[PDB]
Design a protein around this nucleic acid. Structure first.
Length: 157
RNA sequence: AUUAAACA
């Protein structure tokens, strides 16, 4: 079996994934989409990653972590709070999208962290993250913590 | 406070 190095109580599968809590990266190259998602709390899910995301959502809490494609700036993270909906597409989607999901924003931001950029840079077996991919429990945990730290360091609070 | 959740 396999052990979280962040919280060893968390049971992981052989891919480093927790079946209780699962994390996907959304690499953002479209300012209209992320701003609309920040306003409305709806995200359009790509066909290429929809089945894995809906499979995850059967039993786990599912989170999307938003990163800017060109800079690897963190843009925030959100919990998925509905099933995928073929008839809830936001205006900005296209036929590359499967449907919309409601999200609950946890954090929103636009900032650079060297550690976040490193994690994203190596997320795919040592190579750059792919949009929509599922990351390991420890990657998702550490990214949430790093986003929370950067925003706390702002407020500061 | 824009205080991750889960696990306990």
């Amino acid at each position: 079996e396999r052990i979280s190095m962040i919280n060893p109580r968390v049971v992981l599968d052989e891919n480093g994934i927790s079946h209780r809590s699962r994390y996907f990266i959304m690499l953002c190259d479209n300012e209209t989409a992320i701003a609309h998602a920040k306003k409305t709390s709806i995200w359009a899910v790509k066909k290429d990653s929809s089945k894995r995301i809906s499979d995850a959502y059967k039993k786990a809490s599912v989170y999307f972590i938003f990163v800017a494609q060109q800079t690897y700036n963190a843009l925030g993270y959100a919990q998925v709070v509905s099933d995928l909906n073929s008839t809830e597409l936001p205006f900005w989607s296209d036929s590359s999208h499967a449907g919309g999901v409601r999200i609950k924003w946890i954090k929103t931001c636009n900032l650079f962290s060297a550690e976040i950029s490193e994690i994203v840079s190596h997320m795919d077996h040592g190579s750059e993250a792919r949009d929509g991919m599922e990351m390991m429990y420890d990657e998702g945990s550490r990214l949430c913590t790093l986003i929370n730290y950067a925003i706390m360091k702002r407020i500061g609070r």
